[PDB]
Design a protein around this nucleic acid. Structure first.
Lengths: 145, 63
RNA sequence: GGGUAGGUGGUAAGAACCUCAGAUCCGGAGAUUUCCGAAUGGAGCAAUCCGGUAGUUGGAAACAGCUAUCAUUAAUUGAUGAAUAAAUAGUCAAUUAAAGCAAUACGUGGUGAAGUGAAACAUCUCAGUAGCCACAGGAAAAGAAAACGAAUGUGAUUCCGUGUGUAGUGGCGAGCGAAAGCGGAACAGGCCAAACUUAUCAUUAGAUAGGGGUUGUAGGGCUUGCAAUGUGGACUUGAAAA
RNA sequence: CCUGAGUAGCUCGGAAAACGUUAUUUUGAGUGAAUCUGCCCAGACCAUUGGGUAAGCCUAAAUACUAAUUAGUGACCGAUA
RNA sequence: GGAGAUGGGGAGCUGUAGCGAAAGCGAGUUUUAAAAGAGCGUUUGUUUGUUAUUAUAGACCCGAAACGGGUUGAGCUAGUCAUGAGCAGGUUGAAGGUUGAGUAACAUCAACUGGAGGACCGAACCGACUCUCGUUGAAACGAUAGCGGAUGACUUGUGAUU
RNA sequence: UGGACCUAAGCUGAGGCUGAAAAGCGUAGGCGAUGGACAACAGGUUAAUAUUCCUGUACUUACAGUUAGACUGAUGGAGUG
RNA sequence: GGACUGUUUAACUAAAACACAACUCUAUGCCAAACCGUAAGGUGAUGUAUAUGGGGUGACACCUGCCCAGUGCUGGAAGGU
RNA sequence: AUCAGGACAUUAUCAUGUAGAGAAUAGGUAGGAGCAAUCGAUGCAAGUUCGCUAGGACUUGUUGAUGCGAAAGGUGGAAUACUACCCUUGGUUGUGUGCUGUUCUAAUUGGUAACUGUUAUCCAGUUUCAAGACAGUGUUAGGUGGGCAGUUUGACUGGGG
RNA sequence: AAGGGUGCUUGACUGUGAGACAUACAGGUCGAACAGGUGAGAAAUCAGGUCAUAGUGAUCCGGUGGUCCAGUAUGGAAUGG
């Protein structure tokens, strides 16, 4: 349990400060977007330490989000299909897109994804709410057998 | 066994009564829930845990 | 080493003979110990059958002897690394432990019966015993006041006797049965966090080590000076006497 | 400035303590603190007084026994014992 | 202190004052308004060797069907599974099919094939229905003699099986 | 006849899931014939053994060399049994 | 009387008994329902209502008559507890 | 986690309801006979409302100055105008909690499938699908519950019952 | 008459009780007499339920009134007496 929020203007939009509705293991602490911090020192020492942490994470996290958004918008992803009769038979799952992201060398969190499955016939691309400000399209090249 | 692996906290086999003062052997089984535990650098490795130990983990920011 | 005139474990009948280069005999230190057997190469219906690797002598070889070696787990180390890059899971190699037995006597804990006694019996007793399970160690266990307790009372546990068969609780039935104060036996108290500090950890400290500390006549730390070369030790070694 | 957190207490079920659950120990389920001007005990609770510093760890000695070598000892038994 | 009497050892008693539930008072105390009355109390004390009774312990000795805790036995007489074997001999000859007559066609009629049956009689191979036999026997369950099934839900070896 | 080969009923159990300890179950591996596979018969032999002892006739598979051909066949796959 | 082959009380009793084929009820849409335990797990079944589980009678044919006032079960949740 | 209805709270909030009475919502006790007037027209048209239909009027962009005849006479089971509180019927309110019904998943479950460890019908990890804060549970407490444990099951008696 | 009706009336008292009868224990039955204050009666005196006998259930346990009982150190309270 904690009162700390982190890096979100969505999810019952509020200020970038310390605030949390006290209810067990709810989404207020189920997400990596709200850090469980020790409230025993969250008065003056953890206070200014968390202020510094908030400013630092603010800066570095939007920096990395701009970097990854540029990477996504400048790179297109590739699969290979295995159908029969040549008629549309396959689709696109999020597991394989996460695996291709892993191929580049980062473990992207699922919290930027809202879809579950995509149609894999022909060219297909979707722009998702990756982050509060950075938006990019997951350009993927897919063709049948 | 029927115990969380985080500590050896065994169950009870005690005496149960009714509105006759008769004694029988009853098996006090503690609460168990297989919640996902967190450790250093991922590797959650879900294990069966007890509710009291769950709350103690919660109060130490260890999930 | 002692001891030495006989000896080949008892049914000794005798052949063969050993024995005074000091034996046979009584102790210390040893060596080699077949197979099963906790059993460990794997099986197995115990005292059995097939094995693999490594080295070995013989041959042209299958093969034969001749040695050593090959369970499982946990821990450490290293290597390797699946789903899907790292990661993680596994996969292997080397190293340390028991893994097992018994003293029907002992002790802890996890357990855990009724028939009886109450003249029956369900509450209580039968008793935390009967039996079972794990851990042992030669003693175990507990062990240092949030004790007691009613007074300027003691001051880590234990047992014996006394309280006393009292205080008591008990379908107030059968019953069960203490805690204090007293005499005595030996009676050592220590240690880690923890503020705070240095170096080292990737300071998203959430890690090694120098301190520092065990505290109720509250202590310790923090800032700052005198001392003092102490006494104790349950405790590391060697040497000597007994 | 530090004095030992699901920790003390509290509620619903039990046991040990002589007690048949009551002060004191145990949590089986839950709720949950106070930090020396404090926090717990003196068979309920408070006020006064007094006594302690729990929620960290070890230490044996007075005691339990004899399957095990000699010293031996028996108002122990004598081959149905 | 010899596996000894004994010495040391001043803890608790058993009476010495008792009444009243206790507070409490006291040669008195309590019910009591009560000094009255009434109930009780007005000094025989200790520790042992002993005989008889007694509570507690197995309690004068021996005599039940028991209850619980284990531990063991599926080999036979029960079922199950796996895996084999056995059924001499003679009968009864279903259905299906074939051939001719017929049927618009199928159904029907006669003949051929056919071998079917928890089919029949009766060998073995299992069972025990009966008069006797023996009721310490040859035999802790059978013998003569007659009785049933007898290609099945049958018998049955060898493994496990609860 | 079996083991050195397989496996039915089951057993065991590296793994691993449940249970207070005991233990229960369950994968791979590994076991377990009454069955699956095949290459010796005849006669004689001494009191006892005879396809095993002997006379003649055979077959079997493991390897070295040897000629003379062929490129090869699994832990994997289909049939067979 | 039982329909029938047949089966079991061995060492006092195989019959009118049990099995039946044939019906009537009744619970079941999969992790079935039920069954074994402490659970895992397993049968049911590597099955799907034309299937299993459990009742009553028991070939074949004809009939199965009247009663939810009392208990078992189903619907309700309006009303009281 | 999300709200719709949603009951207690009815924070605030503006009118209050023609009792024998009262011209009219005296709803009750009270200093009681004014400057309540930057808490002020007697037309609009009325939202309503008391609805015993007028009545009370809280009601308003063309009106900036109405005045109270209802205060002393009149009615009474209580007097009409500057202050305090009372059955203030409810439009309302912050929502604290409880009832459902739906909207999702990240909690949590699977005995749907694939891949891997592994040639291994169990598990391990993920991804779908199935579901989903219900259940599966663990605790408390009710209802049913001879399947199961123990039990008492009086005596006398021209024998026992 | 200890029977009928009359005024008053609640001694259908308080604390007792030497004593007897009966009797295993229990418990039962009756009563002299003392103190206190009473009603009837002028007084003598009487009145400690009924002319007599059946009109009864033990302890423990549970709380109701008073209480010159105590109050796990003190103070009360709880709590028991």
């Amino acid at each position: 349990m904690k009162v700390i929020l982190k890096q979100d203007v969505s999810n019952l939009g509020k200020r970038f400060d310390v605030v949390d509705v006290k209810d067990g293991y709810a989404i207020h602490f189920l997400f990596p977007k709200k850090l469980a911090a020790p409230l025993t020192k969250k008065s003056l020492q953890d206070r200014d330490l968390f202020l510094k942490k908030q400013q630092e994470h603010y800066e570095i996290n939007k920096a990395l989000s701009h970097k990854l958004k540029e990477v996504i918008e400048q790179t297109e992803l590739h699969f290979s299909l295995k159908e029969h009769n040549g008629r549309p038979y396959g689709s696109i799952i999020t597991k394989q897109i996460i695996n291709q992201a892993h191929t580049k060398g980062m473990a992207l969190q699922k919290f930027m994804f809202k879809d579950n499955v995509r149609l894999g016939f022909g060219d297909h691309e979707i722009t998702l709410h990756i982050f509060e400000d950075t938006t990019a399209v997951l350009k993927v090249k897919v063709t049948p057998d | 066994a029927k115990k969380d692996q985080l500590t050896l906290r065994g169950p009870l086999y005690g005496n149960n009564r009714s509105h006759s003062k008769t004694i029988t052997r009853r098996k006090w089984n503690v609460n168990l829930q297989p919640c996902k535990v967190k450790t250093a650098d991922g590797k959650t490795t879900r294990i069966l845990v007890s509710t009291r130990t769950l709350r103690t983990l919660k109060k130490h920011n260890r999930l």
